[PDB]
Design a protein around this ligand. Structure first.
Ligand SMILES: NC(=[NH2+])c1cc2cc(-c3cccc(-c4ccccc4)c3O)[nH]c2cc1Cl
Ligand code: NA
Lengths: 28, 11, 251
């Protein structure tokens, strides 16, 4: 869906949630 | 435990 | 969710709740993929071993929630179902292989800061993200211990495990339509889904285009957070052609 996966309160405002870091950091 | 939900959602 | 914390408002806006009308109880978790489709685990709907076979009329889908038991007036939406589709080769007799099912909502829902669909992965995103050691996130309002229900949506980030380990942890036959995730006893970290979380989403955030994709569905495990054991999830990408097909065949 084009717009899928971009959260109004986070991605769309450039705000991160407290643990997403953990995830991106596991990707390497 | 669940709180009641509006009657219109059962019908 | 065991050893998971409370979510933040709008952290998983695609998290759905399958609610039963009578009695009024939480059944499973599910996710919103478009404005009319919800995806979940087929065992949440049909499980003959325990005479479970729900129908359209028996369920309610509640989207926009945070709280488990409250009717968050003006924030969540409740929809009725038009049709339920279970995968034709769903295997409840042996290992819950192809544990997936789609639900069509009576009417489309409107998105808000609390309701937004998730992305379903594409061969390339599957390929790059489903790697052992990579974490995903699971959410639900399921139990907090094996044997203790939360008031708010819970979240836990788990690593994907290598298939051989998954296999060597159970006596159930694993198929290519499942993947398992969880920490090794050795990693002094825990977390796990549990009763009530079934059907919900396992998602990852693509570091390429910043979107969240739903790679797996909560399918099964043996106990909740037991050491030496893991959780198994339906492999969404491996069954994506099925998905596409019922969608562009029925709506
Ligand atoms: N990783 C885990 N440890 C785990 C545990 C359970 C436990 C369940 C579960 C337990 C009892 C009943 C149901 C159930 C049966 C029929 C319908 C709805 C729920 C469950 O999904 N689902 C689970 C999914 C997972 Cl990943
Ligand atoms: Na474990």
């Amino acid at each position: 869906e084009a717009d899928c996966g971009l959260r109004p309160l986070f991605e769309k405002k450039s705000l991160e949630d407290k643990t997403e870091r953990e995830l991106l950091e596991s990707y390497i | 435990d669940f709180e009641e939900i509006p009657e219109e959602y059962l019908q | 969710i065991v050893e998971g914390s409370d979510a933040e408002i709008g952290m998983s806006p695609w998290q759905v709740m399958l609610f039963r009308k009578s009695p009024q109880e939480l059944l499973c978790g599910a996710s919103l993929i478009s404005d009319r489709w919800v995806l979940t685990a087929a065992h949440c709907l049909l499980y003959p071993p325990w005479d479970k076979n729900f129908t359209e009329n028996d369920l309610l889908v509640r989207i926009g929630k945070h709280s488990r038991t409250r009717y968050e007036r003006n924030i969540e939406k409740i929809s009725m179902l038009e049709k339920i589709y279970i995968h034709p080769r769903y295997n409840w007799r042996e290992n819950l292989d192809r544990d997936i099912a789609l639900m069509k909502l009576k009417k489309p829902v409107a998105f808000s800061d609390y309701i937004h669909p998730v992305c379903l992965p594409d061969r390339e995103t599957a390929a790059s993200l489903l790697q052992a050691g990579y974490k995903g996130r699971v959410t639900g309002w399921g139990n907090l211990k094996e044997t203790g229900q939360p008031s708010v949506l819970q979240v836990v980030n788990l690593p994907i495990v290598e298939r051989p380990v998954c296999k060597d942890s159970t006596r159930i036959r694993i198929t290519d339509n499942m993947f398992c995730a969880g920490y090794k006893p050795d990693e002094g970290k825990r977390g796990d889904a549990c009763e009530g979380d079934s059907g919900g989403p396992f998602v990852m955030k693509s570091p390429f285009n910043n979107r969240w994709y739903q790679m797996g569905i909560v399918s099964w495990g043996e106990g909740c957070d037991r050491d030496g054991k893991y959780g198994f999830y339906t492999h969404v990408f491996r069954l994506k052609k099925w998905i596409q097909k019922v969608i562009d065949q029925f709506g």
